[PDB]
Design a protein around this nucleic acid. Structure first.
Ligand code: MG
Ligand code: MG
Ligand code: MG
Ligand code: MG
Ligand code: MG
Ligand code: MG
Ligand code: MG
Ligand code: MG
Ligand code: MG
Ligand code: MG
Ligand code: MG
Ligand code: MG
Ligand code: MG
Ligand code: MG
Ligand code: MG
Ligand code: MG
Ligand code: MG
Ligand code: MG
Ligand code: ZN
Lengths: 71, 213, 81, 74, 39, 103, 135
RNA sequence: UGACAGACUGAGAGCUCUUUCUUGAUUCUAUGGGUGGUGGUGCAUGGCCGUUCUUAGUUGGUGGAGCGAUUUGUCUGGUUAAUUCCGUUAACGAACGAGACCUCAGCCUGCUAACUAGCUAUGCGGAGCCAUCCCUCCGCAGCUAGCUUCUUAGAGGGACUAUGGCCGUUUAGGCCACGGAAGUUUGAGGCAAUAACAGGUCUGUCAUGCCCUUAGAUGUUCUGGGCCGCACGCGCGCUACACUGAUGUAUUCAACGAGUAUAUAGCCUUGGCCGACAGGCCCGGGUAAUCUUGGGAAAUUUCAUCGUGAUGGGGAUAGAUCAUUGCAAUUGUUGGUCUUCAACGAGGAAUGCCUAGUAAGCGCGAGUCAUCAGCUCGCGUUGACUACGUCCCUGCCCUUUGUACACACCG
């Protein structure tokens, strides 16, 4: 039931693009980093987006990845 | 002495009787709403319209009429309450003004579809994220039918409906029936606050550009 | 409606002094606020002024708001002034 | 204060159990309460942590949280 | 001998808190008075 | 010289009322007054349930209207003019002030 | 004292105490009354009047400021109305008022300022002395 | 225009009449026009509401295909609660719905506090007692607090499937496990698309077209009666058919809400006294976290009595009387007291609701309200059995397929 929707998925890819090196594997630091690169309207949605940037960055740190274009 | 429950209801009912009284008269004036403020030693009734010279009458004759009968009716100390007439900063963003404009066109004898598209493009040209207009009644034929004119964006569910949609319903008494008018106008995110709301849509995001140093 | 000249005269005194007036739908209350009348004479002579368009009547959802109009001030001027 | 009869007995249970370890944490030893806690926890987990369970609100169309008025077709 | 302050209807009337509205005219004016339907 | 003056605040609005509440507190804290507040009072919740239909037909469906009412209290050890010298800032729309002289 | 002893077994002791603590007056309506509107039969026990006293001599001991309109509630209970649903029912005040009257005359309780009925200085003694006389 | 007595009439309605006063151009008479109508038509309408339909569905622009209706987009597949995603791809890029959102509940010995909330300490005061002090329970006040654990209400914090494991196009996601207040979107609700229905509502609305009537009224007002009537069939329910109980003691634990000058105390009503109950008289408190009320709720828990008996289960029916509400109690408003003691022995064919503080049990508050709650909307209290599935019955969504159906298989 926790399938991440388009907004969480799309923002998560897009937010990595603009700030890749600035991110990490920590969910809470990623939550805080995500706090000061955007303006959002709910903390539940923030954790969802930061949740889809944390492990996504393992699969990025592990191998290649789709539309997101890392310099 | 009166308690808090009876107090808050008393203020609320006063607003409704006032606002539903400011529609009987300022119908063909572009009345859009009323701000009932209560200052020390004075209580404000900030009427606001899209045609201010009409509500004032000549040299403030009509406003004299209005303040005094409000004075008398709702038992205020004389010289207590006042009425004021502001102008609406935008006309297209207020469905009350647009519904009444559309009503007066249909009453006068403008063709129905000429009126609805005229309203629709005005509201959009006024800066709205979207507009929606519904007319329902007997047009040219005894069986009733409903026409819907839509433009731009429009939401219908969730909490943000309350803080982004300005909607009005007005009856029209065209001969041989009643055509009801629904004007649903969608506002745009305006941080200044004067035209549109201040918070954005709940699922709108802005990823700030990554400045380089 | 049979209003006395006395009862008639007290209606329109208030009209000049203030300009506005307000009754309710409440029939035969026997004491109008702000004046002395059983509320039927006021209501049904406002209708006489409204029929002859000396008052502008916003029926105000059965709550009877009235504003005296220039057409009738001149005519009501020639009765008690 | 509050609750019923049974709920209070389950309450005093935690009050007694928790109050001991808080006293032990603050005044005896921090590792002399690790023994105490695992006595309480290996028996029942609800002598330290409450039940979040509460009275689900009533909704209309019936006189219960889930129960609905009996339905008749003819 | 108690009717709606809005329409003068004798049925479905709400004296609670001293509104004296019928159950329908109230619903028509509910948000204006300030009764928010939070739930 | 130094009295017991109580300011009572009620409103329908959480955010709006705490705008005024804190301003009064910071108003008088800039005067180093004895400001004992805010004492926060149980929120009253007026309620009406009405049938949604105008005709009593269909699945009987009910809407629960309600109103939150918030109750705030401030204590000032001050004078009847020091209370009014402070409480002259712009009172935000609708917020109810009813300062009285306590015992 | 009072709280270390069973609020039941103790009142048996204090019900045996107002028998043999000299004596007092006793209504010429005692043996007929049902003590409440909703009761079905009058109290079964013959020496119920002192048990009601002993049970209600601890009320003021363990509280303060109870009138008759509150003492009615303390002994009221459910009421079965036959066909219609059952409710709460408030018991009678003639019994409750008079128990107070007797213990007033005997120096266990007194009338209370600020309203109500308040325990005596020396009545507290015996309710604590006989309390000590319970296992 | 208004009236005396009597007739006439329930009527102290002057309604009409006897008679002769009284008001003074207000009116009355006819033509015409208005007005009112809980009168008709929801198959003339608006608005609102329900329902199709609680599911996941709907639609442009440009481009492609077809003479055209139409189609594609909107999908083979995996996944999801979801047209939600991964992807696919003659489509590309968008709009609604879904989600997000909003509200109460579940954690915060961290923050702002708080005598209209309240512990904690100390001063005294009462008692018990190895007793003099100490130990214990209690009541009253304060510059007692390096008071806010408990209560209120603001801020924000916290959960994101985050970490681990197996599964999987090793994608989206699935199952689990330590931790945690919390891992069905944590719980429950609010809002909620397109297209429709000849769905309901003209009896909510001086919302409303047309028609009917408009002074001997379908207008209004008053008296009285009816909506409640009883051979019978139906639906939601209350109380039971008892011992896992009835009664009578003793014992004592909530939460949500509520108190319109209510007139000379008055809505909620404490405390005193009278009274067997019912109910009175008295002093008062509160426009309320302040008084009612920290709402001393019931089931429950104890201790006896009953003993398989239509019994003391059960409480219909009815007789006598008393008290309260109201202008009025009759076709018993209701609450008492005594007496009367019915059917009912777990309910045939059928059939409803329901998956954890849930079902079921128990009581309380609010709406209506002068009085009446077997109702509805909320609240808390005790608190399970079962299942963790399927498409069998009843239905819903999508695809493929057949149709002689299109008011559409009730064809
Ligand atoms: Mg029962
Ligand atoms: Mg009629
Ligand atoms: Mg219809
Ligand atoms: Mg309709
Ligand atoms: Mg095309
Ligand atoms: Mg072509
Ligand atoms: Mg196309
Ligand atoms: Mg949900
Ligand atoms: Mg209607
Ligand atoms: Mg009926
Ligand atoms: Mg029902
Ligand atoms: Mg019995
Ligand atoms: Mg019992
Ligand atoms: Mg009731
Ligand atoms: Mg299932
Ligand atoms: Mg075939
Ligand atoms: Mg055919
Ligand atoms: Mg057939
Ligand atoms: Zn109404």
């Amino acid at each position: 039931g926790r399938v991440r929707t388009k907004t969480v998925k799309k923002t998560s890819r897009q937010v990595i693009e603009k700030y890749y090196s600035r991110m990490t594997l920590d969910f809470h630091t990623n939550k805080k980093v995500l706090e000061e690169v955007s303006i959002l309207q709910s903390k539940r949605l923030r954790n969802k987006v930061a949740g889809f940037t944390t492990h996504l960055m393992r699969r990025i740190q592990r191998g290649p990845v789709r539309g997101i274009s890392l310099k | 002495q009166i308690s808090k429950k009876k107090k808050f209801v008393s203020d609320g009912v006063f607003y409704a009787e006032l606002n539903e009284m400011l529609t009987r008269e300022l119908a063909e004036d572009g009345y859009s709403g009323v701000e009932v403020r209560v200052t020390p030693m004075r209580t404000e009734i900030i009427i606001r319209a899209t045609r201010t010279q009409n509500v004032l009458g000549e040299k403030g004759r009509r406003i004299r009429e209005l303040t005094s009968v409000v004075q008398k009716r709702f038992n205020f100390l004389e010289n207590g309450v006042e009425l004021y007439a502001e102008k609406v900063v935008n006309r297209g963003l207020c469905a009350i003004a647009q519904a009444e404009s559309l009503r007066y066109k249909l009453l006068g004898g403008l063709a129905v579809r000429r009126a609805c598209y005229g309203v629709l493009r005005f509201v959009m040209e006024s800066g709205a994220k979207g507009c929606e207009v519904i007319v329902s009644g007997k047009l040219r034929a005894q069986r009733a039918k409903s026409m819907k004119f839509k433009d731009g964006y429009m939401i219908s569910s969730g909490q943000p409906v309350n803080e982004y949609i300005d909607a009005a319903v007005r009856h029209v008494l065209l001969r041989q029936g009643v055509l009801g008018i629904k004007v649903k106008i969608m506002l745009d995110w305006d941080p200044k606050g004067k035209l549109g709301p201040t918070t954005p849509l709940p699922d709108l995001v802005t990823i700030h550009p990554p400045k380089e140093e | 409606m049979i209003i006395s000249k006395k009862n008639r005269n007290e209606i329109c005194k208030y009209l000049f002094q203030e300009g506005v007036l307000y009754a309710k739908k409440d029939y035969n209350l026997a004491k109008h606020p702000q004046i002395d009348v059983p509320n039927l004479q006021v209501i049904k002579l406002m209708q006489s002024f409204k029929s002859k368009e000396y008052v502008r009547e916003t029926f105000s959802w059965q709550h009877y708001y009235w504003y005296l109009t220039n057409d009738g001030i001149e005519f009501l001027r020639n009765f008690l002034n | 204060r509050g609750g019923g009869k049974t709920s209070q007995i389950y309450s005093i249970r935690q009050a007694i159990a928790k109050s001991l370890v808080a006293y032990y944490q603050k005044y005896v030893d921090e590792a002399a309460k690790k023994e105490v806690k695992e006595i309480f926890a290996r028996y029942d987990r609800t002598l330290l942590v409450a039940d979040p369970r509460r009275c689900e609100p009533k909704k209309f169309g019936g006189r219960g949280a889930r129960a609905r008025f009996q339905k008749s077709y003819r | 001998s108690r009717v709606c302050r809005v329409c003068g209807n004798s049925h479905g009337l709400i004296r609670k808190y001293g509104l004296m509205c019928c159950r329908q005219c109230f619903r028509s004016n509910a948000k204006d008075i300030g009764f928010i339907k939070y739930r | 010289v130094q009295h017991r003056i109580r300011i009572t605040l009620s409103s329908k609005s959480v955010k709006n009322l705490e705008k005024v509440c804190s301003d009064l507190v910071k108003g008088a804290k800039e005067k180093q007054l004895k400001v004992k507040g805010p004492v926060r009072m149980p929120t009253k919740v007026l309620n009406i349930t009405t049938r949604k239909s105008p005709c009593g037909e269909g699945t009987n469906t009910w809407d629960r209207f309600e109103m939150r009412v918030h109750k705030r209290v401030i204590d000032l050890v001050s004078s009847p003019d020091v209370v009014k010298q402070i409480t002259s800032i712009t009172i935000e729309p609708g917020v109810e002030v009813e300062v009285t002289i306590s015992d | 004292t009072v709280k270390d002893v069973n609020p039941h077994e103790f009142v048996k002791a204090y019900s045996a105490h107002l028998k043999r603590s000299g004596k007092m007056e006793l209504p010429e309506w005692v043996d007929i009354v049902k003590t409440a509107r909703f009761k079905e039969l009058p109290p079964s026990d013959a020496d119920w009047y002192y048990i009601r006293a002993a049970s209600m001599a601890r009320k003021i001991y363990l509280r303060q400021g109870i009138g008759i309109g509150g003492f009615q509630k303390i002994y009221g209970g459910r009421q079965r109305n036959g066909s219609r649903p059952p409710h709460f029912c408030k018991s009678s005040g003639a019994v409750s008022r008079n128990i107070l009257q007797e213990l007033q005359k005997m120096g266990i309780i007194d009338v209370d300022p600020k309203g109500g009925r308040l325990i005596t200085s020396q009545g507290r003694r015996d309710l604590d002395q006989v309390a000590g006389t319970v296992p």
